[PDB]
């Protein structure tokens with residue numbers, strides 16, 4: 012029973028680092044896993060392969076002329092734990108849709124049969140900075156049924172998480188696509204552990220894990236490797252193991268309930284990241300009030 | 301001579317705040333300016349209109365059934381300095397392309413003739429987090445000829461800036477679309493003033509302004525207004541005036557020269573934001589080295 016998963020979330024909060032460390036812990040569970048990277052920069056596999064940047068299907072279809080002129084040897088690599096690694100590649104900037112890099116990539120892996128081969132998990136590392144039909148490709152073409160959203164106690168991350176949810180909603184009533192939970196990637200904001208459980212409930216799922224911000228994640232990272240690989244005996248290593256536990260063992264897959272902007276500011280004001288408004292000074296000069 | 305401009309750049313570095321403050325100083329120059337907001341959240345006009353969030357063409361085409369059922373009174377507002385303000389609106393999450401909200405909006409303004417009416421400047425606030433053909437709509441349909449990119453001394457902002465540039469390149473040899481310069485929105489990183497001039501040269505333009513990070517921008521902002529409007533006698537107000545000067549007076553419009561990733565890490569390592577690599581430890585456990 013090979014399960015199809017995707018890790019969606021906003022950029023710059025270290026989504027990929029957690030995707031890769033989660034996956035590394037699952038290979039330590041003895042699960043064969045394949046990461047399909049879907050970002051324009053090739054950052055979705057570089058901790059598993061010890062790479063500066065893995066070569067992408069777009070760059071190499073450009074070398075060969077078309078996609079059929081490519082063989083799986085150099086498209087799909089494997090590293091720590093025989094974790095298979097593809098990078099889809101980015102759209103030609105300013106002209107292509109991002110989504111077509113990702114279909115080109117899934118189609119190329121269905122055809123050279125990497126999907127029905129021995130695998131336990133597929134994980135698509137997808138950006139959530141814009142929730143358009145471009146980035147919703149693995150949702151719409153029913154390639155990822157289990158979506159876990161990475162966020163933090165901060166507006167844009169949570170905004171992203173809600174919008175990803177609205178998309179799961181449209182496609183839920185014509186497929187197996189469900190939200191399996193949220194993951195807080197700590198930004199050391201005061202009581203964000205709580206904030207993301209609050210959000211996870213008003214959406215109808217759980218906060219399946221709180222990932223703290225250790226120092227070792229950064230020290231393993233400058234070595235182009237995971238914390239599971241660098242120091243298995245650290246606190247943080249156990250954090251990812253525990254997340255990878257919960258993901259196998261999870262059966263709480265839902266069709267979420269998106270909130271409003273007003274409701275979202277509630278959550279941010281209540282837990283104190285957002286400042287409680289004063290319209291008694293809105294629109295007034297330095298001098299007036 | 302009404303000039304068509306776009307402000308492209310990565311999110312979360314306060315692009316919109318500088319777009320709106322720049323435009324506010326131009327209304328103080330006595331220029332009629334229209335901001336066309338292109339982001340899925342309505343944050344491109346809210347400092348000019350003192351608004352929580354301006355209503356968007358997408359939400360209101362949804363009310364009325366189609367776009368023709370809308371009149372310019374409530375689509376296009378005006379605030380501080382008779383600065384016209386439209387918000388394009390976002391794609392239905394997970395299904396539409398972002399680009400079609402922006403064509404639907406420019407087409408609606410061409411037809412109800414807001415473009416040939418008395419105007420000096422048009423400014424499209426466009427996201428740069430993904431440089432796909434979706435967000436390159438104002439470039440491809442030759443609606444913005446002068447593109448000024450906002451960035452900072454940090455990897456992703458610079459990456460964004462280069463990618464926007466690759467886009468200007470593809471569309472330059474079939475239109476008047478040019479890069480008029482970069483703008484560093486300081487993040488108080490040590491010597492980023494320098495870094496962005498270095499980048500602006502290896503690309504072939506200029507760093508047309510350095511915008512510092514004042515405290516007053518934040519205090520004007522919680523009042524839903526610009527610094528030009530809140531305290532004209534601050535240092536920061538003068539900063540935006542100087543930028544708005546340079547933009548009118550600018551005639552250095554180019555077809556840029558994108559650099560590589562390697563060249564980009566050069567610039568980051570040279571000015572000290574990026575750490576000088578050691579591959580003598582890449583791939584080694586805590587224990588080995």
Ligand code: SF4
Pocket residue numbers: 107108109110143144145146396397398399432433434435
């Ligand atoms: S659908 Fe999204 S990724 Fe595709 S071209 Fe449009 S905005 Fe870009």
